[PDB]
Amino acid sequence: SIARSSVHAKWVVGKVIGTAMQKTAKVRVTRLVLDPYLLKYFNKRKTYFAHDALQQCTVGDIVLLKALPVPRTKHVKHELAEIIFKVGQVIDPVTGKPCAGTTYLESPISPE
Amino acid sequence: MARKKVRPRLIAELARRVRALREQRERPRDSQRYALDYETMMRPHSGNRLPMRAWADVRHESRLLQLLNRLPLFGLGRLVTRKSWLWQHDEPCYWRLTRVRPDYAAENLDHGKAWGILTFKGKTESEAREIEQVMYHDWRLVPKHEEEAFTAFTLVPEDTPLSVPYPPLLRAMILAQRQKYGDTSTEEPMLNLERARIDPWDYPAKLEAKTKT
Amino acid sequence: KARDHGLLRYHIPQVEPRDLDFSTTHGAVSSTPPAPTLVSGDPWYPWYSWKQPPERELSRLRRLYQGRLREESGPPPELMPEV
Amino acid sequence: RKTRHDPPAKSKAGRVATPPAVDPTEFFVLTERYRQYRQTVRALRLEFMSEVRKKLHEARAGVQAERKAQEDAAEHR
Amino acid sequence: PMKGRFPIRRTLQYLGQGDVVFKDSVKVMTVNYNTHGELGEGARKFVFFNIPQIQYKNPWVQITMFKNMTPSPFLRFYLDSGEQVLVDVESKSNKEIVEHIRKILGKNEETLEKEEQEKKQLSHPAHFGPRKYCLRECMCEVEGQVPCPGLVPLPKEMTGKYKAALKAT
Amino acid sequence: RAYRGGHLTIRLALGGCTNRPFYRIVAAHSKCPRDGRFVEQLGSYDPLPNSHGEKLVALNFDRIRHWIGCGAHLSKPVEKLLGLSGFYPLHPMMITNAERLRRKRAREVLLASQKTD
Amino acid sequence: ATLNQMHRLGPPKHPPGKMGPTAGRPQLKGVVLRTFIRKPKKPNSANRKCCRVRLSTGREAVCFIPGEGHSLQEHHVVLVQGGRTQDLPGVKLTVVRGKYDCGHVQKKK
RNA sequence: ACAGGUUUGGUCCUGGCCUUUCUAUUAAUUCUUAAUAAAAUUACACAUGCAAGUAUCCGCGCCCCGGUGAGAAUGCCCUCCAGAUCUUAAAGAUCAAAAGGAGCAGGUAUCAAGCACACCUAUAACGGUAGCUCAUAACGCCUUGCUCAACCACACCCCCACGGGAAACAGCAGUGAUAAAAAUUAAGCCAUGAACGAAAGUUUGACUAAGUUAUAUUAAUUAGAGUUGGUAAAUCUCGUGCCAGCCACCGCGGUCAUACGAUUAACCCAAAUUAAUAGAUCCACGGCGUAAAGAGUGUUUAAGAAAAAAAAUCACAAUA
Ligand code: FES
Ligand SMILES: [K+]
Ligand SMILES: [K+]
Ligand SMILES: [Mg+2]
Ligand SMILES: [Mg+2]
Ligand SMILES: [Mg+2]
Ligand SMILES: [Mg+2]
Ligand SMILES: [Mg+2]
Ligand SMILES: [Mg+2]
Ligand SMILES: [Mg+2]
Ligand SMILES: [Mg+2]
Ligand SMILES: [Mg+2]
Ligand SMILES: [Mg+2]
Ligand SMILES: [Mg+2]
Ligand SMILES: [Mg+2]
Ligand SMILES: [Mg+2]
Ligand SMILES: [Mg+2]
Ligand SMILES: [Mg+2]
Ligand SMILES: [Mg+2]
Ligand SMILES: [Mg+2]
Ligand SMILES: [Mg+2]
Ligand SMILES: [Mg+2]
Ligand SMILES: [Mg+2]
Ligand SMILES: [Mg+2]
Ligand SMILES: [Mg+2]
Ligand SMILES: [Mg+2]
Ligand SMILES: [Mg+2]
Ligand SMILES: [Mg+2]
Ligand SMILES: [Mg+2]
Ligand SMILES: [Mg+2]
Ligand SMILES: [Mg+2]
Ligand SMILES: [Mg+2]
Ligand SMILES: [Mg+2]
Ligand SMILES: [Mg+2]
Ligand SMILES: [Mg+2]
Ligand SMILES: [Mg+2]
Ligand SMILES: [Mg+2]
Ligand SMILES: [Mg+2]
Ligand SMILES: [Mg+2]
Ligand SMILES: [Mg+2]
Ligand SMILES: [Mg+2]
Ligand SMILES: [Mg+2]
Ligand SMILES: [Mg+2]
Ligand SMILES: [Mg+2]
Known part of the structure; x- marks a missing residue:
């Protein structure tokens, strides 16, 4: 059962930047870093490459990434796991209903 | 560790290949490597001077190959003894030669590597091991009529104790632990001196290494 | 010093x-219970004491180390006097 | 300290070694002590080796380890 | 601190007084909240107050914000084994969320206290060396032992200069 | 530091100022310097007697046997130091030096008495 | 300067000091090239005894001789400090008396 | 910082420089003794002696210790870790290459674009897609050993070292040159550490114990230096007359100087004192009408705020 990885990040969540290359999406991960002087947290942006076998990435999505056990090249070290939020097509994880921002597209209290 | 300004050095790899190629092509032969001057006791090749404890044996004995060349098949199946074991051990110690390949560089054919079967203190091993310390000027050859005289051995059982008392401070902790945990037996602890058998220092070591088992 | 004396x-x-x-x-x-070798007065190990080697072994060593041999000595004294 | 490639000295280039004298009675007794001393330490060394194996095995798949593993798993569910 | 709405929350004590330690299996925490409506008061105050405290004790846990994407605020946790924990907050206050999080994925009090107890033995008091790692630096700092020759000069009988003079004489 | 080889060894590390030696029982790689980086410090050894006439020695017995169990070599003085404590049997060289002292002392006593008479 | 701007620019760090006339070295050795007299600026008027020497670094600079009376001539070896004279613009070195070819001030006799 | 001196005829405000504190090197003046710590110009050229041997021949060891800070923004922390070695019941441990990244990491944007720096299929070819890094600083340039139980790097030079230039002390001591920088061409393996031997043991300029030097601290046997207008503790009598000279900042001297030089007296440190250069420290969680500061204007991208409430305007000289 040896399927570990040498990278420090096993699971990360980032926003898709572009899908120009073939079967690979460039995503932007955001993390909070404490400024030593002001003692305040600011976002730090880093770019990651994720392999999408099904070509399901659209610019503006939020995608969970899983650490790749073996790197495929010097840059692609992560593999796409799921599409957390499709752009424009967002379903509430609680009620399982389509929504557009704040207004529900479909009323959850109307089964029929 | 790595950086973005890594320069692809190539001369270091180039030197490694040539240096490795040179030693393989220019590998010193056993005759010229072990050729020795018998007056200055200095090795012309390595520039080393032998210790004074070995000066007497060089001039008053011959090495293995000097006493092995004048044999039909270079003494296959013969028994070869060594002066080192004879002086210190009353029990017979000898080697049963399996194969031997001398080097053709020597004009007198007095060098080479040989294998054999080990018989130390009457104990015989079931595997062939390469003969160590061949170049030493202490080897001797047994006659045909004396082959059975040395072969016959009288097995003497060992009288060494199989258990010894523990060291005093370490013995106390053994008693303390079992008393603390509830084991109140007053039997004196003993150390099993059975797995710690030590071969004598003169026993030759395996020249070949050991692979993963 | 004053604080050490309570003043x-x-x-x-x-x-x-x-x-x-x-x-x-x-x-x-x-x-702890005495060791069996402690009550008897015997040394904790047999080789701690001095034992006279067999004469055959002495002859073998003299032949091996001939020329550079040194004068031998007997058993060491049991108790060392004071000057 | 010198390196591999530097040449050796000139004055100390003829001598090799000068072993000291050997006391026949003393050397044999000393040799006997070493043979028993090494054997005793080797048994202690192997005894300590087995202790390390016991300690390491208990830390990996010990009974308490399974209890801890099941407790956190049960709490998580 | 002078600037900011609540300058107290940007001091070391405030960052250090938050006691929420995630387990080793927690890697990603996703928080979604709305900037409008009275229902999101608990979520917004949780982001404004408690999130810096949570991140300070979990430097290796990624925290990402998303505003106005889901009408119902919620928190999502991603584990190492791919397990997903969904926490729903729609009326819970600032304090309720912290207590709820501390129980589902926070570490037990007994685990935290035993963790630091095993850390204390690393700095064993019986060792010697530099002040940063050991208490004493030399044996002369122990009452009763022979003092350092720098402070109190040693007697002449023990000085090596006197020992060598008599040997050569 | 990256060394070619070497074996783990428990030895004594010198310390203190001039005329005041102080050895630390430490376990470090054989190829590292005497006062260089080490794995774990075991104990201490005060070579000079205190006001009570005692030479204090500290031993980390459970950790000492742990390193010996994993194949750590021991130098000459640590074996003598462990031999005195009783964790190990008395070193053969410790006994021989004792026997030499008795014979030298016996010769000294006899030599003085011969001159006296 | 709001919080975001302060974060972007980072904390202010004091710049390193600029090297003085002696290039960061406490004292320098020079060879006398010419001896002349320099006059101060008002309201201080006098005839200051200065000299022009070339330092060990190869540069040529103007130096000043403190004290009353001197016997310095061309191609003499002297030692210069890093002090400055307030009355004379440009002069930023002083010869330390009592070293090499320049001795201490001679008491009236 | 508990602050002080200094703008102006004068007050307040804003704003620089400097004083007062501690550490190191060199120099000046001075100097009695002992102990401990430390020993530092130069990656420039080096005379001579020494720094690796051990051992019944094989073998093992031979910048490992030590030395240096040239080079490189090198790195710190961290994940993984082949391989070498030691131990043995072949699975435990020590050191850890290469490779990789949550974060952290000198100055400079008057260095703003680098110019192939990406990826897919199967192959480990071919073919196909046209991308990758970067104003959160890419790509450049300049300076530099370090975040210290220690770490990184170099071993005459040509990043390397087949080769070539060329003929090597950045091992201890010592010499030439050079620099403001000035330790003995010494003793011993007694201790500890390392190499080798089964072992007595051998080698070891690492080290141990000494030699040398106010470089620091202490004790005592030892007394000189600086300063005396103000900030800042302290003086008189003469000489000199904007002259000779003094000052860290403000300033003094132009025949009645507590500031120059000498004398008397005093003050303050003390085997040290003073000066010179570096370093610790020190700017803005402060400001933008009049002071250095809201850029000639509007929209938008990156980015960020929303949280309680509430808000599409309008007689008139917009513009084309
Ligand atoms: S510091 Fe302990 S003897 Fe000096
Ligand atoms: K001021
Ligand atoms: K020694
Ligand atoms: Mg040799
Ligand atoms: Mg010392
Ligand atoms: Mg001045
Ligand atoms: Mg002025
Ligand atoms: Mg002089
Ligand atoms: Mg004004
Ligand atoms: Mg005025
Ligand atoms: Mg000096
Ligand atoms: Mg002295
Ligand atoms: Mg041998
Ligand atoms: Mg070093
Ligand atoms: Mg330098
Ligand atoms: Mg440099
Ligand atoms: Mg550079
Ligand atoms: Mg590594
Ligand atoms: Mg491994
Ligand atoms: Mg292994
Ligand atoms: Mg080179
Ligand atoms: Mg060399
Ligand atoms: Mg050189
Ligand atoms: Mg030198
Ligand atoms: Mg010289
Ligand atoms: Mg000096
Ligand atoms: Mg001199
Ligand atoms: Mg001399
Ligand atoms: Mg010597
Ligand atoms: Mg000797
Ligand atoms: Mg020895
Ligand atoms: Mg050995
Ligand atoms: Mg000394
Ligand atoms: Mg005076
Ligand atoms: Mg004056
Ligand atoms: Mg007058
Ligand atoms: Mg004044
Ligand atoms: Mg005066
Ligand atoms: Mg203005
Ligand atoms: Mg203005
Ligand atoms: Mg504007
Ligand atoms: Mg504008
Ligand atoms: Mg937006
Ligand atoms: Mg028109």
């Missing part, structure tokens, strides 16, 4: 006892 007052914090359980039962503080 001057200074703060003395309250200190808890050093140990949690006060038990003298353990063998570290209680006397």
